[PDB]
Amino acid sequence: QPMEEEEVETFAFQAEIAQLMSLIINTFYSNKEIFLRELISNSSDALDKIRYESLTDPSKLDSGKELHINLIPNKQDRTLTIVDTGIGMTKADLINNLGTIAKSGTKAFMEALQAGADISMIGQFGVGFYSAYLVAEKVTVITKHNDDEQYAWESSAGGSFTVRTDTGEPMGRGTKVILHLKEDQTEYLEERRIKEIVKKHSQFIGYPITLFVEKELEHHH
Numbered sequence: 001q002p003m004e005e006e007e008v009e010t011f012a013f014q015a016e017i018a019q020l021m022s023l024i025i026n027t028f029y030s031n032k033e034i035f036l037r038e039l040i041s042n043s044s045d046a047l048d049k050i051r052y053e054s055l056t057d058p059s060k061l062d063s064g065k066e067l068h069i070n071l072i073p074n075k076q077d078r079t080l081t082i083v084d085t086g087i088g089m090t091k092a093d094l095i096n097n098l099g100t101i102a103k104s105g106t107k108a109f110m111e112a113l114q115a116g117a118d119i120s121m122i123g124q125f126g127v128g129f130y131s132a133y134l135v136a137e138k139v140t141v142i143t144k145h146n147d148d149e150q151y152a153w154e155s156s157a158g159g160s161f162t163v164r165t166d167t168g169e170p171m172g173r174g175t176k177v178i179l180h181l182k183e184d185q186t187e188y189l190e191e192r193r194i195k196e197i198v199k200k201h202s203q204f205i206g207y208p209i210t211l212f213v214e215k216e217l218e219h220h221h
């Protein structure tokens, strides 16, 4: 008789990834806006990937031809969501690429920071995604790859993350990164702030970037 039932898996982050997340989410930096550049950069790469695949197999765009990036601030939920129609991830991709297997860059980046590097260089070590925790207390990733189910990944950086099937609104293809913002980081929900950050840092992204300001209408939250 339950409306829904689903299995939820909990995985431990690999140690260096856990270490990186703790350093990022706890440390003061004065240039936190760079997180948006890193996430938009990931979307652009994911969009490059599906586009490349579609070169030799057009039917890979049966799940949607438009290649673009949406930014969706929601003040009532205090969330900023970055959505793309890129290649998406399989369940194994989520588990493997978002916490259980460390690349050398995870330790390299922390080494670099010790050697005097700047947090803004995180993208050069292939781990820019985790810069999301500069501004977010929790991150939810919803993703759909061709021929696969839609999955939801989530972590509040406790040393572990969860994976489960996402039964909400079906995406055609791609990835949503939902940032549940820290209380003092709500500036990044403001249209003015989002525009100036995109203009400054993402000028050379070769895909449409579109803002959708989300508001839940009264009595209809």
Ligand SMILES: Cc1cc(-c2c(Cl)cccc2OCCCC(F)(F)F)nc(N)n1
Binding pocket: 039, 042, 043, 044, 045, 046, 047, 049, 084, 086, 087, 088, 089, 097, 098, 129, 141, 175, 177
């Ligand atoms: C498929 C996908 C994957 C990611 C992504 C996430 Cl959520 C966490 C950590 C690394 C990532 O990509 C690395 C690059 C993945 C590549 F090469 F497929 F683009 N982001 C988006 N928007 N889309």
